[PDB]
Design a protein around this ligand. Structure first.
Ligand SMILES: [Mg+2]
Ligand SMILES: [Zn+2]
Ligand SMILES: [Zn+2]
Lengths: 48, 468, 1205
């Protein structure tokens, strides 16, 4: 509903086609935070 | 005790004494003396004079710029031609007497000394000055690297003892091969490496015809002259930092901080020191102020705006503002574009164009209205985004196009698909569409025409009409 | 996708790996073409194209060339969104120190190099040298040389030594350090050290060094050589309307850095004088520091707004930072907002929604259904029909929202009841219609209030709203368990009026067959609502065991009471309705209906009660008039008497018999007494009336005055407000707080003059300002509590622990304050509740104490019990279901995955706005203190025993003489140390005096083993101890406030838990707020989460180290299983802020506050965030490990282990 650019478009398409289901993704705000912290010369990375 | 860098700069600069007239003349004399030693060191080189002679030969043929050759004459092409002809004749005499009569003979030494005296009455443009310096600098650096590589390969006192005259001579190699000390085994292996090194040596020496002692002494006098010159320039720059600050004080609150203006004025002062002339009799501040002001103004024109405006357009804007101020003072109201254009003797359209570009970008953190927790950046949209309604419409259009094309024979359906790029990466012209069918272009054209005519029938075009 | 977040230092190679190019020019965009400039801050060759699948040339302008780099420009043909991910880098001419690792106290560079911050700054600020390689010289590494001294030792030794200035020197010193060698040397020194300050200094340095070795980071990475550059779209320069451009301050800071770096490179190319180069390097360092953290180093750089530029640290930190403005809280789609009205016709699960507002909210669903039924062929046609507002669109909207729950939220959301789920009903209007009974839940009144609405989209969200968040499920307060949908105002007034009794009313003495005949008589004007009649009532009782007994009998009642009984559900006694019904009576009725019948019956009963109350309040015709305010005739006489004796005592003051202070005190006393007398007279005149009964005599009847009925029913008003209306306003206070001698002897009916109104404003302004500030104080306290308790989730069912806390009735004198039933309601028994004087197990172990067992305990008269508590829980992470007990909002045992910590924090913080020896019983006397115990065995009196009529065990008859809130809660939860704390007995032994050292006194104590322990005490202390007395541990030596840390250290966990709970509950109960103690114990457990190691043992723990208690517990269990010496710990009590900032996860700590320190510590240590709490999963957008996500998270952990096998 806020900042998943692909997720909200997929949700809109799914609602239009009846399937009330979502595929949550990563908020863009967290990516902005990651880029900012890396810009402060600090290595922040998502381990898998 | 303090954290402001400006205060620290004033502290460090204040520990230098302000120069007087006699001190300025003395430091200028030291600069000229060091430059003279550097020029004399360059002149004692077999390759330096030929370059100047060929440059003069090209210039006298009215093929090269006269300014690029020389910039002045030292006095203790009306005149340049005579002096350069004398220099050419004296070079011919030196080449006649350089080695036929003997290098150590009085003729060669007297000829070299008088060549030095003649060349001392010359003021070269710094570009070819630096070129001639760079050639010898590269030669000296290569010689130093080869010597240090040889010393690293062998690894001392023995090399130093036979360094004076036999550093590059094969006598050193022969004698060391004759040596039979316990460590000369690996050293002889390393002597092989020295062979590979010294083979790279003589082609340099025959390029200079100076062996090792002469080039070392030339490098030495060049180093002393450069050091003296650099110390003198540093002294004058340190003395005139206060003048730099006094000049830069007036350009504060114009997009740049005080320290940036100070540094740019320091660069301008360096340039002024680099091209000062004490023979003119004027004080240093007179010449230095122009360069410091130029540096500061250019730096403001280049680094005071987020969207850079060229320097000439900046001057145009400033002169427009000055004329607007004068006209508003004269008539009591804001000048109109037409009147400003009339006064500037410039087209009104150009005046409007200049007036539309004099804006500094607004910050996104500026509080909006009377609030303080709201910012302008929260009211800026993302116009590049695609509305989800548009994407859903695109998907529906894709599905409807597929459904409509499914109501055709495969030939025309695929012809349209390939001619419009539907479900493929690239669009295709008529030739590639024809090639797959093996048919020519015209049949493809009429196939597409038939498909378009059939798809315009309202029996199978009502669903596609709603997208218009 | 990802399971952890790893933080650490950034190497220059890593920064170059991130970057897609090098920014070489400060240019941003051309001033004419508005296109990016090459090698600039917005370069399309480095950061990506500005148009989708295009290049700056325009040669490649379609999708067929995706991934192809244009030869003329170098711009890759791809999407523009890569400009939000692609980074750059700047190759700095000279190294610059990182401001975070230099000036964020403690300075990590200074700690690592064992040099003061001032010396390091002096090296950085280009003032004096530092030696990097001492060589074969007496010079030592890291010692500081002035310029003159440098020249002397340079002329002395020459090239044997190396001495430098700036960040290059710091990086050449940090890189030359041998971390293992320093660690071993400092380990050896700490082994042979004695001083405590030195021990602390080198233990901190050893922790830093070991963290550096373990993390793999290098110290020299703390000095920047390559500076990363943010993506342009995160620092955008976009055009505004009118040709103006909007830019971020990061662009200005980056331009300054690039300009100064280029100037430094040019100066180094010119063989500049040294002074200019040092100045340029200082400017470069200052620019980098301003870009990273503006204002920390010195004067903050300001732009053309005369306001400081915003840096990256400001962008990631603060209330307006990314964490709190965009990660923990967001603006959402499918939302709306409107003013709220009252819908008295709605059901408890229904809310009135405007048609247009629902049309805008539910638009995609309308499109979907408009295509499904074929009304619109494509989505454009559906959009056109929705825009044109056709009738079939309205039918589609009605079908869409039929069973679709909607979320209603009112700001501020103090507790979870502030967001609820309702079924929308389309209404014609623009205002949301809200059920009255939820208003108390929302704290909402219809005076301009606005509410927001949200639409759950997925099926999971809809079922969550229907099952958990629906209003019909949320009828019990999670803070106390009491009903929250209790009627108020008109409903209470109507139920009160209908259930009143009148003397000699029409229809008195009539016999009625039942409630139906009573209603028939009322509608036929035969009998009044308040006529005393006899009614045949069929009444069914549902017993505890489930027996349903129906009894039909004739009861003396009123017509209105039977008509109200007509709506009472079966299973309740008639005694609940056979009385006048105030707010308390209706609350009791609803509570009994919930406890004996369930939820559906309670909901229907509440709806019927609200309907009946509204209807009969309308039919009552109750009105306020000027004749309803009857001022008693005794008020004037009392005022005259008070004024007369004031004159008399003024005459006494002129005679010198008494002082001014005594005169003031007695004037205030008499004015209070006169106010009390006037209030009593007015209340007596207002509460009663004389009527004529059937026999003709005069009978005493309770008054039907409108104001009296409003106050007595509890709908609105109280005795004090009636006193101000019809009696006296009373004494008021000056702005400082002093009470004025002359009070307001006039009420609001007669009217005040100018002076009295001014005096009243004096206090009204104070009240308004106090409310305004206390709101912010309560908000901050609630935020701290939530951040300290957000990790508490019920993870297991039973932890299998035998520990527990003791529970006794709370006694504060000769009467009980709270009963044992109230405290034991909903707790699990720890050890069996044996009958007094008997070995029968009345209540076995592990049984929830509901109302039935509470009644059983009360009947048996059991005094002290033991119950499980969250503080004593053995769960490794979170708590278990049994140690928590009943969940107050549901009525049963707490379920798995319940976020009890957030509930506890909200329950404690919500009432913050409301916040500012003779025996009397017959029994025996027991001494421990003085206790009086009744014959039944209950302790009913507790009194202190200062250092008596009866001895121990002697029976005492009745009458025998044996002989400010909110700050307090804040300091209590923060473990604040009192200014003058009570000196406590550190060890048990005999007290002995010592040398009276100048300044302050010393004392000694002799233990049982003969060891002498010395104590340091101030001079001004009224000692309670005497020499020759063996004082026990925890005995008070000097009286005063007790520090919670001392209580924890010398008494234990139970004592500090009881102390904190008792003080907080005293503060809350002073204001009449009921909050369960398990919430305060869920906060206290979070406080007690750290331990300082006393015995290192063989575990990987160092003495003097503060580590988490759970990790030590698991390590001790593992060591015991391995038969190795376990560790010994001393538990530490931390405040909510320190405990919040001391969490294992750094994401939550950074999101709470002090982002700079948390990030610096995590980066130097190389911490790992496992995403185990609520805040981390909220920030990264994953399911929280509470409630419906719990099982999901559990599944993943299982797979983790199974893969790790
Ligand atoms: Mg309101
Ligand atoms: Zn291109
Ligand atoms: Zn437990």
């Amino acid at each position: 509903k806020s900042d998943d650019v692909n997720g909200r478009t997929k949700m809109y398409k799914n609602i239009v086609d009846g399937n009330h289901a979502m595929e949550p993704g990563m908020p863009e705000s967290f990516n902005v935070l990651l880029k900012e912290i890396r810009s402060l010369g600090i290595n922040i990375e998502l381990e898998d | 005790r303090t954290t402001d860098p400006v205060r620290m700069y004033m502290r460090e600069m204040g520990t230098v004494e302000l120069l007087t007239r006699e001190g300025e003349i003395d430091i200028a004399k030291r600069i000229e003396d060091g430059i003279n030693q550097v020029q004399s060191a360059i002149a004692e080189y077999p390759g330096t004079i030929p370059y100047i002679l060929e440059q003069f030969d090209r210039v006298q043929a009215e093929e090269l710029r006269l300014t690029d050759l020389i910039s002045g004459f030292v006095d203790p092409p009306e005149l340049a031609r005579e002096k350069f002809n004398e220099l050419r004749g004296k070079f011919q005499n030196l080449q006649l007497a350089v080695n036929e009569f003997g290098r150590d003979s009085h003729q060669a030494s007297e000829a070299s000394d008088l060549v030095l005296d003649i060349f001392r009455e010359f003021r070269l443009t710094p570009k070819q000055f630096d070129h001639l310096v760079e050639t010898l600098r590269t030669s000296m650096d290569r010689v130093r690297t080869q010597e240090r590589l040889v010393m690293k390969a062998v690894v001392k006192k023995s090399f130093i003892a036979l360094f004076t005259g036999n550093e590059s001579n094969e006598e050193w190699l022969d004698k060391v091969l004759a040596s039979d000390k316990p460590y000369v085994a690996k050293v002889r292996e390393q002597e092989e490496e020295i062979r590979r090194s010294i083979q790279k040596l003589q082609m340099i020496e025959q390029e200079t015809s100076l062996s090792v002692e002469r080039i070392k002494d030339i490098s030495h006098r060049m180093s002393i002259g450069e050091a003296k010159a650099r110390r003198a320039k540093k002294e004058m720059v340190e003395a005139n930092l206060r003048l730099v600050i006094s000049i830069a004080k007036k350009y504060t609150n114009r997009g740049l901080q005080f320290l940036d203006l100070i540094q740019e004025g320091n660069i301008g002062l360096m340039k002024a020191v680099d091209k000062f002339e004490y023979r003119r009799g004027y004080k240093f501040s007179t010449y230095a102020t122009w360069w410091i002001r130029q540096a500061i103004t250019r730096s403001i024109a280049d680094q005071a705006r987020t969207i850079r405006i060229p320097v000439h357009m900046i001057e145009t804007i400033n002169k427009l503002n000055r004329i607007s101020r004068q006209m508003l003072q004269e008539m009591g109201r804001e000048p109109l574009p037409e009147e400003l254009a009339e006064r500037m003797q410039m087209p009104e359209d150009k005046i409007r164009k200049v007036l539309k570009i004099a804006k500094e970008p607004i910050s996104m953190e500026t509080p909006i209205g009377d609030d303080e927790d709201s910012h302008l950046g929260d009211f800026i949209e993302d116009t590049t985004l695609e509305l989800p309604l548009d994407s859903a419409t695109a998907t529906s259009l894709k599905a409807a196009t597929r459904d409509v094309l499914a109501g055709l024979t495969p030939r025309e359906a695929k012809v349209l698909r390939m001619r419009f790029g539907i479900d493929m990466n690239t669009d295709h012209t008529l030739e590639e569409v024809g090639k797959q069918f093996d048919v020519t272009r015209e049949r493809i054209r009429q196939i597409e025409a038939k498909a378009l005519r059939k798809l315009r029938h309202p029996s199978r075009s009502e669903v596609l009409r709603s997208f218009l | 996708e990802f399971d952890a977040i790893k933080i650490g230092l950034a190497s220059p190679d890593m920064i170059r790996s991130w970057s897609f190019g090098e920014v070489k020019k400060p240019e941003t965009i051309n001033y004419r073409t508005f296109k990016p400039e090459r090698d600039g801050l917005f370069c399309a060759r480095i950061f990506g194209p500005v148009k989708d699948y295009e290049c700056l040339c325009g040669k490649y302008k379609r999708l067929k060339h995706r991934g192809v780099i244009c030869e003329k420009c170098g711009v890759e043909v791809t999407q523009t969104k890569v400009r939000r991910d692609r980074m750059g880098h700047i190759e700095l001419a000279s190294p610059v120190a990182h401001i975070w690792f230099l000036k964020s106290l403690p300075s990590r560079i200074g700690l690592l190099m064992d040099m003061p911050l001032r010396d390091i700054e002096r090296v950085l600020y280009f003032e004096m040298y530092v030696v990097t390689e001492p060589g074969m010289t007496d010079l030592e590494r890291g010692q500081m040389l002035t310029e003159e001294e440098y020249l002397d030792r340079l002329e002395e030794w020459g090239d044997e030594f190396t001495a430098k200035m700036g960040a290059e020197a710091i990086k050449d010193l940090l890189a030359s350090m041998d971390l293992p060698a320093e660690a071993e040397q400092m380990r050896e020194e700490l082994d042979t050290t004695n001083s405590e300050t030195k021990r602390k200094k080198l233990t901190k340095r050893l922790k830093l060094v070991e963290a550096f070795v373990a993390s793999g980071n290098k110290p020299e990475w703390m000095i920047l050589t390559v500076l990363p550059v943010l993506p342009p779209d995160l620092r955008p320069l976009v055009p505004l309307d009118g040709g103006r451009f909007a830019t971020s301050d990061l662009n200005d800071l980056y331009r300054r850095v690039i300009n100064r770096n280029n100037r430094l490179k040019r100066l180094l190319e010119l063989a500049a004088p040294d002074i200019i180069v040092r100045n340029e390097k200082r400017m470069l360092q200052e620019s980098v520091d301003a870009l990273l953290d503006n204002g920390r180093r010195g004067r903050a750089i300001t732009g053309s707004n005369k306001r400081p530029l915003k840096s990256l640290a400001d962008m990631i930190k603060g209330k307006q930072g990314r964490f709190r403005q965009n990660l923990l809280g967001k603006r959402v789609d499918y939302s709306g907002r409107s003013v709220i009205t009252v819908g008295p016709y709605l059901r408890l699960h229904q809310c009135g929604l405007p048609k247009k507002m629902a049309l805008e909210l539910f638009k995609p669903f309308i499109y979907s259904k408009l295509e499904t039924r074929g009304l619109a062929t494509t989505i454009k046609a559906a959009k056109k029909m929705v825009e044109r507002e056709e009738a079939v669109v309205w039918d589609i909207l009605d079908e869409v929202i039929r069973e679709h729950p909607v979320l209603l939220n009112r700001a501020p959301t103090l507790h979870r009841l502030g967001i609820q789920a309702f079924e929308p009903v389309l209404i014609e209007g623009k205002a949301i219609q809200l059920h009255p009974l939820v208003c108390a839940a929302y704290n909402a009144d219809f005076d301009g209030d606005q509410m927001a609405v949200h639409v759950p989209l997925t099926l999971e969200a809809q079922l969550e709203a229907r099952t958990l968040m629906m209003s019909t499920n949320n009828i019990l307060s999670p803070a106390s368990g009491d009903p929250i949908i209790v009627p108020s105002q008109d409903v209470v007034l109507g139920l009160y009026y209908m259930t009143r009794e009148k003397i000699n009313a029409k229809g008195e003495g009539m016999y009625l067959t039942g409630p139906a005949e009573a209603e028939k008589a009322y509608r036929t004007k035969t009998a009044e609502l308040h006529a005393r009649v006899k009614v045949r009532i069929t009444e069914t009782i549902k017993h505890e065991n489930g027996k349903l007994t129906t009894e039909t009998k004739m009861i003396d009642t009123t017509v209105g009471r039977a008509m109200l009984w007509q709506i009472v559900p079966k299973g309740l006694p008639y005694s609940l309705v056979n009385q006048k019904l105030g707010k308390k009576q209706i609350s009791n009725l609803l509570n009994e209906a919930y406890r004996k019948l369930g939820l559906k019956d309670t909901v229907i009963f509440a709806d019927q009660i609200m309907y009946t109350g509204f209807a009969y309040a309308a039919l009552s015709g109750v009105s306020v008039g000027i004749d309803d305010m009857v001022v008693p005739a005794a008020k004037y006489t009392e005022i005259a008497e008070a004024e007369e004796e004031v004159r008399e005592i003024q005459e006494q003051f002129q005679s010198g018999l008494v002082t001014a202070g005594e005169r003031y005190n007695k004037v205030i006393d008499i004015w209070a007494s006169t106010n009390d007398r006037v209030a009593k007279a007015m209340m007596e005149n207002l509460s009663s009336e004389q009527v004529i009964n059937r026999q003709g005599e005069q009978e005493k009847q309770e008054s039907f005055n409108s104001i009296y009925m409003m106050a007595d029913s509890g709908a609105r008003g109280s005795a004090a407000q009636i006193r101000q209306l019809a009696g006296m306003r009373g004494l008021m206070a000056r702005p400082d707080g002093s009470i004025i001698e002359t009070p307001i002897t006039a009420n609001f009916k007669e009217g005040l003059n100018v002076l009295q109104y001014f005096i009243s404003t004096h206090g009204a302004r104070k009240g308004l300002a106090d409310t305004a500030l206390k709101t912010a104080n309560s908000g901050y306290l609630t935020r701290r509590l939530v951040d300290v308790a957000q990790d508490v989730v019920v993870t297991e069912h039973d932890c299998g622990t035998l520990e527990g806390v003791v529970m006794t009735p709370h006694i504060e004198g000769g009467d009980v304050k709270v009963a044992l039933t109230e405290l034991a309601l909903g707790r699990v028994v720890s050890e069996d509740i044996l009958k007094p004087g008997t070995d029968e197990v009345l209540i076995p172990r592990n049984t929830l104490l509901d109302e039935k067992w509470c009644k059983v305990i009360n009947d048996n008269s059991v005094d002290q019990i033991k119950v499980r508590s969250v503080v004593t829980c053995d769960s490794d992470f979170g708590c278990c279901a049994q140690c928590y007990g009943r969940d107050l909002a549901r009525g049963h045992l707490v379920n798995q995955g319940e976020a009890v910590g957030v509930i506890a924090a909200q329950s404690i913080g919500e009432p913050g706005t409301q916040l500012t020896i003779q025996a009397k019983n017959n029994g025996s006397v027991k001494l421990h203190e003085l206790t009086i115990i009744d014959e039944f065995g209950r302790t009913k009196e507790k009194h202190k025993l200062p250092y008596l009529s009866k001895a121990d065990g002697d029976a005492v008859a009745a009458g025998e003489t044996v002989a400010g809130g909110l700050p307090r809660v804040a300091d209590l939860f923060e473990a604040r140390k009192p200014k003058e704390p009570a000196i406590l007995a550190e060890h048990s032994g005999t007290v002995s005096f010592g040398k009276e050292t100048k300044g302050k006194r010393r004392l000694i104590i002799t233990r049982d083993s003969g060891d002498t322990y010395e104590e340091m005490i101030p001079k001004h202390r009224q000692l309670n101890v005497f020499e020759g007395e063996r004082i026990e541990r925890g005995d008070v030596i000097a009286d005063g406030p007790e520090s919670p840390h001392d209580i924890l250290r010398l008494r234990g966990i139970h004592a500090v838990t009881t102390y904190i709970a008792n003080e907080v509950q005293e503060v809350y109960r002073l204001q009449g707020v009921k909050i369960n103690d398990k919430h305060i114990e869920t906060i206290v457990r979070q406080m007690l989460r750290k331990c300082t190691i006393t015995f290192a043992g063989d575990s990987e723990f160092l003495p003097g180290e503060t580590v988490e208690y759970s990790q030590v517990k698991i390590a001790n269990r593992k060591l015991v299983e391995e038969g190795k010496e376990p560790a010994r710990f001393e538990r530490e009590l931390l405040g909510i802020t320190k405990a919040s900032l001391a969490t294992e996860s750094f994401i939550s700590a950074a999101s709470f506050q002090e982002t700079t320190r948390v990030l610096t510590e995590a980066a130097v240590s190389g911490k790992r965030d496992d995403l185990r709490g609520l805040k981390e999963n909220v920030i990264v957008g994953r399911l929280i490990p509470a409630g419906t996500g719990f099982a999901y998270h559990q599944d993943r952990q299982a797979k983790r282990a199974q893969e790790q096998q």
